[PDB]
């Protein structure tokens, strides 16, 4: 849910935003103790969105 | 419900906000009526729901009457708001709520010349409302009660026929006769003569039935009566 | 006054005896009524009953007048089983044949203009209602030229409309003419049709009139209109595409009325609600992107009231309309454009009920927050929605306390420490562990055991309450259940030791409660596990010896612990 927060942040201010990079790192890694694949698919979807957002402007 | 347990400062702020929102809803007619009916009904439910003890913490009835006084003395804000009736509506809807809620009272009881109150929570509600209205009734006149007093006296006499064990009847009717002779309901309309006869018959029958009653009741009975007008 | 008392006493005595002369002496001895011959009673007592101004005035206004309505109905029924029923019907016809109303439609209402006219109007209203209660609904009545008696409805509508652009005395007079209207059967459909008045108000404000005219006597009007159970309601829900406030209002009126009318039979209201629940899909212009979001929560609330009013078991499984309305609810769940608050109210109705349910549960609960709530600052509207939502989840589960919902919720909180307000979480846990049947609690225990597969934080975030506040019958029977489930489970490495800690924390308490035949075996089976003397080693020592302290409680509590 904050995934789109920092996603829209990076695609409004147009920076690599390594802070947002770490935020999405948290968003994707939060599965070590978790066997609930729905989190995994949501997180991979959001990081694909951020992959193409990296593709977008400067990162 | 949050209004009690307050110190006078924020309690006054709360009552001012209450009157302000009351005006604001009054601006919306249908909303005014439905909202006031519901809130007064449920608020009286909660107030009478207050328990007592035989002779943060538990809230008291004692404060809300002061809110009603502010209701009667809240011109200082409505004038400013209308720049960019009140007590009429207050008295009206209060009468509606209190009477509609008196109607609810189921007052079954037994003796076990003893007494066995079978509806003690209803007793607590009744005494709470008696105390509150006695903190409420004395100021305001029958201006928006005089049409009501007819049906009032009627239904209170009815409840006496059901249970002649309520000092509240001629409590309300004591303040009522106060207001009536204050306006001289007596003039020597059919309602006028009929309601005179209601007074006469009711007072006479209780004045003879007094023999059956006991302390804190028969004393309430005689006070109950003596208020009756000349 | 005493003379009138004597008069009224004579009147009541003789009129009761007249009823008996019809009742105690039937048609067989109606000739004893013929002894009355002319029966000036037929021409005076009718006046007395319609107007106690004909027994004098019934001054004193005592029990006798309150007795008048029922005993008048008694007398009229006695006349009905008497040959003079037609004679008295004619008698009252010259007493009145709806002549009065033709002019009393203009009694100058809406203020203390003239009230004695209204007094006589109320008296004749009472007389008409006695006739209604005595079966003289339309017989004595000169019934309307049309089958439906507009002679009340349209006049009331017109007056209540114009005379504002109020009076509680006029209000109760309007109520009296309302019961007169109710004495006219079949009007219900007309009242439905007309009550949908788009006629807006004319003054600061402007709103349609018929809705408020209804709201004046909403409860009584609903009581009349719902004698037609749903046919009128069906007609309404045909027309409820745009206006629901009227229909929703009348719904909740009879809803809380079915509540009030539970002393006699709420199953009347239960039947009505169930029937209209069937008669939901005949209009579905709502609950999707087809109604106002306002209207969406409105229908949400109405259905919630229905679900509360009927038994939750009624249509928690396919019982007729349970598929249709249940699927509507499922849509609403999928209708995720709600505010998180609105989603919480949608949640409130979940415990009313099968895996498909759980599936929508997960696909819903995902879309709130990934793992953390502290990532959303306190005071942010999202945060407030979150906290209210977890409140809703806690209370709804506490109601249901199903093992499924329980585990779903624990998994939700099994993301961050103190991110779903774990204090209230465990308080609800305390309240549900004491709650629930022993079998239900044990099933909850099975759920927590299976979800036990940090790898320890799972059980560590939802255990003490089960270990402590479940009854020591579910607790004892679950002990018996997992005797072997622990014996076996006695025996990278981080996960292993997390499991070992979970075993510590489960086994200690279940010993400490109560002690079958594998006693010393199990005692050794636990001490050997402790016996050994990274930080996981300190955690080992502390947890193992706390469990050892437990296993001292009932055995090896004296001394000499088999060294």
mmCIF file of C-alpha atoms in Angstrom, chain B residues 23-225:
data_model
loop_
_atom_site.group_PDB
_atom_site.id
_atom_site.type_symbol
_atom_site.label_atom_id
_atom_site.label_comp_id
_atom_site.label_asym_id
_atom_site.label_seq_id
_atom_site.Cartn_x
_atom_site.Cartn_y
_atom_site.Cartn_z
ATOM 1 C CA UNK B 23 -29.301 25.514 16.076
ATOM 2 C CA UNK B 24 -27.409 24.085 13.106
ATOM 3 C CA UNK B 25 -29.704 21.063 12.910
ATOM 4 C CA UNK B 26 -32.648 23.387 13.548
ATOM 5 C CA UNK B 27 -31.765 25.075 10.267
ATOM 6 C CA UNK B 28 -32.680 21.747 8.619
ATOM 7 C CA UNK B 29 -36.363 21.384 9.437
ATOM 8 C CA UNK B 30 -37.051 17.676 8.961
ATOM 9 C CA UNK B 31 -33.562 16.963 10.251
ATOM 10 C CA UNK B 32 -34.259 19.277 13.182
ATOM 11 C CA UNK B 33 -37.389 17.394 14.218
ATOM 12 C CA UNK B 34 -36.215 13.819 13.725
ATOM 13 C CA UNK B 35 -32.801 14.477 15.255
ATOM 14 C CA UNK B 36 -34.126 16.266 18.328
ATOM 15 C CA UNK B 37 -36.786 13.625 18.927
ATOM 16 C CA UNK B 38 -34.270 10.797 18.769
ATOM 17 C CA UNK B 39 -31.550 12.467 20.817
ATOM 18 C CA UNK B 40 -33.830 13.687 23.592
ATOM 19 C CA UNK B 41 -35.516 10.297 23.774
ATOM 20 C CA UNK B 42 -32.277 8.355 24.063
ATOM 21 C CA UNK B 43 -30.634 10.915 26.329
ATOM 22 C CA UNK B 44 -33.534 10.689 28.746
ATOM 23 C CA UNK B 45 -33.228 6.910 28.501
ATOM 24 C CA UNK B 46 -29.602 7.146 29.586
ATOM 25 C CA UNK B 47 -30.317 9.703 32.312
ATOM 26 C CA UNK B 48 -33.121 7.690 33.888
ATOM 27 C CA UNK B 49 -30.825 4.682 33.470
ATOM 28 C CA UNK B 50 -28.612 6.235 36.153
ATOM 29 C CA UNK B 51 -28.864 4.061 39.285
ATOM 30 C CA UNK B 52 -28.806 5.367 42.858
ATOM 31 C CA UNK B 53 -27.934 4.063 46.329
ATOM 32 C CA UNK B 54 -30.272 3.387 49.228
ATOM 33 C CA UNK B 55 -29.607 5.822 52.137
ATOM 34 C CA UNK B 56 -14.346 8.879 36.047
ATOM 35 C CA UNK B 57 -16.884 7.755 38.639
ATOM 36 C CA UNK B 58 -20.637 7.417 38.147
ATOM 37 C CA UNK B 59 -22.005 10.500 36.340
ATOM 38 C CA UNK B 60 -24.618 12.692 37.978
ATOM 39 C CA UNK B 61 -27.967 14.020 36.817
ATOM 40 C CA UNK B 62 -27.194 17.311 38.547
ATOM 41 C CA UNK B 63 -25.355 18.918 35.640
ATOM 42 C CA UNK B 64 -27.579 18.499 32.586
ATOM 43 C CA UNK B 65 -30.253 20.753 34.066
ATOM 44 C CA UNK B 66 -27.652 23.513 33.903
ATOM 45 C CA UNK B 67 -27.337 22.695 30.219
ATOM 46 C CA UNK B 68 -31.086 23.213 29.972
ATOM 47 C CA UNK B 69 -30.698 26.562 31.715
ATOM 48 C CA UNK B 70 -28.162 27.490 29.061
ATOM 49 C CA UNK B 71 -30.697 26.262 26.498
ATOM 50 C CA UNK B 72 -33.125 28.780 27.950
ATOM 51 C CA UNK B 73 -30.355 31.414 28.053
ATOM 52 C CA UNK B 74 -28.483 30.768 24.790
ATOM 53 C CA UNK B 75 -29.441 33.936 22.896
ATOM 54 C CA UNK B 76 -25.836 35.185 22.971
ATOM 55 C CA UNK B 77 -24.826 32.701 20.262
ATOM 56 C CA UNK B 78 -27.954 32.291 18.141
ATOM 57 C CA UNK B 79 -28.167 36.047 17.586
ATOM 58 C CA UNK B 80 -24.619 36.059 16.209
ATOM 59 C CA UNK B 81 -25.243 32.982 14.064
ATOM 60 C CA UNK B 82 -28.563 34.223 12.650
ATOM 61 C CA UNK B 83 -26.799 37.502 11.873
ATOM 62 C CA UNK B 84 -24.782 35.600 9.261
ATOM 63 C CA UNK B 85 -38.491 29.567 18.491
ATOM 64 C CA UNK B 86 -35.450 28.470 20.478
ATOM 65 C CA UNK B 87 -36.837 27.969 23.963
ATOM 66 C CA UNK B 88 -40.136 27.222 22.270
ATOM 67 C CA UNK B 89 -38.579 24.169 20.632
ATOM 68 C CA UNK B 90 -36.641 23.218 23.754
ATOM 69 C CA UNK B 91 -39.741 23.177 25.954
ATOM 70 C CA UNK B 92 -41.805 21.459 23.269
ATOM 71 C CA UNK B 93 -39.484 18.572 22.515
ATOM 72 C CA UNK B 94 -38.613 18.170 26.191
ATOM 73 C CA UNK B 95 -42.309 17.746 26.942
ATOM 74 C CA UNK B 96 -42.643 15.249 24.105
ATOM 75 C CA UNK B 97 -39.690 13.167 25.278
ATOM 76 C CA UNK B 98 -40.526 13.189 28.971
ATOM 77 C CA UNK B 99 -44.154 12.274 28.373
ATOM 78 C CA UNK B 100 -43.450 9.587 25.775
ATOM 79 C CA UNK B 101 -40.967 8.073 28.203
ATOM 80 C CA UNK B 102 -43.329 8.244 31.179
ATOM 81 C CA UNK B 103 -45.688 6.223 29.001
ATOM 82 C CA UNK B 104 -43.150 3.384 28.903
ATOM 83 C CA UNK B 105 -43.103 2.826 32.665
ATOM 84 C CA UNK B 106 -44.080 -0.705 33.648
ATOM 85 C CA UNK B 107 -44.448 -0.652 37.419
ATOM 86 C CA UNK B 108 -45.385 -4.130 38.592
ATOM 87 C CA UNK B 109 -44.802 -4.679 42.306
ATOM 88 C CA UNK B 110 -45.997 -6.755 45.253
ATOM 89 C CA UNK B 111 -45.957 -6.658 49.052
ATOM 90 C CA UNK B 112 -43.621 -9.640 49.366
ATOM 91 C CA UNK B 113 -49.005 -4.073 54.198
ATOM 92 C CA UNK B 114 -45.418 -4.542 53.056
ATOM 93 C CA UNK B 115 -44.016 -3.593 49.647
ATOM 94 C CA UNK B 116 -42.194 -5.657 47.013
ATOM 95 C CA UNK B 117 -41.030 -3.492 44.096
ATOM 96 C CA UNK B 118 -41.022 -5.847 41.111
ATOM 97 C CA UNK B 119 -39.649 -3.194 38.705
ATOM 98 C CA UNK B 120 -36.792 -1.623 40.697
ATOM 99 C CA UNK B 121 -35.020 -0.386 37.565
ATOM 100 C CA UNK B 122 -38.254 1.296 36.503
ATOM 101 C CA UNK B 123 -38.357 2.768 40.011
ATOM 102 C CA UNK B 124 -34.836 4.142 39.565
ATOM 103 C CA UNK B 125 -35.742 5.620 36.193
ATOM 104 C CA UNK B 126 -38.846 7.212 37.695
ATOM 105 C CA UNK B 127 -36.988 8.759 40.616
ATOM 106 C CA UNK B 128 -34.215 9.989 38.325
ATOM 107 C CA UNK B 129 -36.723 11.696 36.050
ATOM 108 C CA UNK B 130 -38.600 13.115 39.043
ATOM 109 C CA UNK B 131 -35.416 14.634 40.421
ATOM 110 C CA UNK B 132 -34.301 15.974 37.052
ATOM 111 C CA UNK B 133 -37.635 17.519 36.083
ATOM 112 C CA UNK B 134 -37.917 19.079 39.527
ATOM 113 C CA UNK B 135 -34.534 20.569 38.730
ATOM 114 C CA UNK B 136 -36.059 21.486 35.346
ATOM 115 C CA UNK B 137 -39.749 22.361 35.623
ATOM 116 C CA UNK B 138 -39.784 25.259 38.140
ATOM 117 C CA UNK B 139 -38.330 27.987 35.923
ATOM 118 C CA UNK B 140 -40.274 27.622 32.697
ATOM 119 C CA UNK B 141 -43.923 28.617 32.571
ATOM 120 C CA UNK B 142 -46.770 26.694 30.929
ATOM 121 C CA UNK B 143 -46.347 28.915 27.858
ATOM 122 C CA UNK B 144 -45.645 25.793 25.820
ATOM 123 C CA UNK B 145 -47.281 23.520 28.402
ATOM 124 C CA UNK B 146 -50.728 25.028 28.978
ATOM 125 C CA UNK B 147 -52.239 23.190 25.976
ATOM 126 C CA UNK B 148 -50.403 20.105 27.223
ATOM 127 C CA UNK B 149 -51.548 20.320 30.850
ATOM 128 C CA UNK B 150 -54.988 19.012 29.886
ATOM 129 C CA UNK B 151 -53.736 15.709 28.482
ATOM 130 C CA UNK B 152 -51.071 15.714 31.181
ATOM 131 C CA UNK B 153 -53.437 15.848 34.145
ATOM 132 C CA UNK B 154 -55.489 13.281 32.270
ATOM 133 C CA UNK B 155 -52.790 10.672 31.776
ATOM 134 C CA UNK B 156 -51.215 11.282 35.181
ATOM 135 C CA UNK B 157 -54.621 10.698 36.765
ATOM 136 C CA UNK B 158 -54.745 7.556 34.648
ATOM 137 C CA UNK B 159 -51.412 6.313 35.970
ATOM 138 C CA UNK B 160 -52.672 7.083 39.469
ATOM 139 C CA UNK B 161 -55.635 4.830 38.746
ATOM 140 C CA UNK B 162 -53.103 2.217 37.661
ATOM 141 C CA UNK B 163 -50.689 2.947 40.515
ATOM 142 C CA UNK B 164 -51.647 5.549 43.124
ATOM 143 C CA UNK B 165 -48.117 5.286 44.538
ATOM 144 C CA UNK B 166 -46.313 8.081 42.673
ATOM 145 C CA UNK B 167 -45.502 11.398 44.316
ATOM 146 C CA UNK B 168 -44.414 12.655 40.898
ATOM 147 C CA UNK B 169 -47.991 13.050 39.678
ATOM 148 C CA UNK B 170 -48.851 16.128 41.713
ATOM 149 C CA UNK B 171 -45.175 17.014 41.645
ATOM 150 C CA UNK B 172 -45.523 17.856 37.969
ATOM 151 C CA UNK B 173 -49.057 18.937 38.721
ATOM 152 C CA UNK B 174 -47.819 21.166 41.543
ATOM 153 C CA UNK B 175 -45.597 23.060 39.165
ATOM 154 C CA UNK B 176 -48.484 22.795 36.699
ATOM 155 C CA UNK B 177 -51.046 24.390 39.011
ATOM 156 C CA UNK B 178 -48.406 26.971 39.846
ATOM 157 C CA UNK B 179 -48.208 27.899 36.174
ATOM 158 C CA UNK B 180 -51.970 27.562 35.655
ATOM 159 C CA UNK B 181 -52.994 29.931 38.431
ATOM 160 C CA UNK B 182 -50.038 32.035 37.309
ATOM 161 C CA UNK B 183 -51.897 32.292 33.997
ATOM 162 C CA UNK B 184 -55.298 31.818 35.689
ATOM 163 C CA UNK B 185 -56.570 28.778 33.868
ATOM 164 C CA UNK B 186 -59.575 29.421 36.132
ATOM 165 C CA UNK B 187 -62.092 31.997 34.904
ATOM 166 C CA UNK B 188 -65.263 30.919 36.711
ATOM 167 C CA UNK B 189 -63.621 26.655 26.860
ATOM 168 C CA UNK B 190 -65.075 23.197 27.494
ATOM 169 C CA UNK B 191 -61.544 22.065 28.289
ATOM 170 C CA UNK B 192 -61.474 24.692 31.039
ATOM 171 C CA UNK B 193 -64.532 23.517 32.979
ATOM 172 C CA UNK B 194 -63.765 19.862 32.288
ATOM 173 C CA UNK B 195 -60.210 20.200 33.573
ATOM 174 C CA UNK B 196 -61.475 22.073 36.625
ATOM 175 C CA UNK B 197 -63.702 19.081 37.311
ATOM 176 C CA UNK B 198 -60.668 16.848 36.835
ATOM 177 C CA UNK B 199 -58.853 18.807 39.529
ATOM 178 C CA UNK B 200 -61.856 18.671 41.826
ATOM 179 C CA UNK B 201 -62.594 14.968 41.527
ATOM 180 C CA UNK B 202 -58.941 13.940 41.663
ATOM 181 C CA UNK B 203 -58.132 16.082 44.676
ATOM 182 C CA UNK B 204 -61.247 14.999 46.546
ATOM 183 C CA UNK B 205 -60.700 11.297 45.948
ATOM 184 C CA UNK B 206 -57.046 11.430 46.963
ATOM 185 C CA UNK B 207 -57.941 13.590 49.974
ATOM 186 C CA UNK B 208 -60.236 10.839 51.176
ATOM 187 C CA UNK B 209 -57.990 7.923 50.136
ATOM 188 C CA UNK B 210 -55.077 9.429 52.095
ATOM 189 C CA UNK B 211 -55.996 7.200 55.046
ATOM 190 C CA UNK B 212 -54.354 4.176 53.412
ATOM 191 C CA UNK B 213 -50.883 5.650 52.991
ATOM 192 C CA UNK B 214 -47.619 5.695 54.899
ATOM 193 C CA UNK B 215 -44.566 7.804 55.678
ATOM 194 C CA UNK B 216 -42.550 9.292 52.798
ATOM 195 C CA UNK B 217 -45.685 8.528 50.788
ATOM 196 C CA UNK B 218 -48.614 9.998 52.719
ATOM 197 C CA UNK B 219 -46.380 12.975 53.468
ATOM 198 C CA UNK B 220 -45.637 13.185 49.760
ATOM 199 C CA UNK B 221 -49.386 12.743 49.346
ATOM 200 C CA UNK B 222 -50.219 15.760 51.452
ATOM 201 C CA UNK B 223 -47.553 17.941 49.826
ATOM 202 C CA UNK B 224 -48.773 16.499 46.531
ATOM 203 C CA UNK B 225 -52.199 17.915 47.402
#
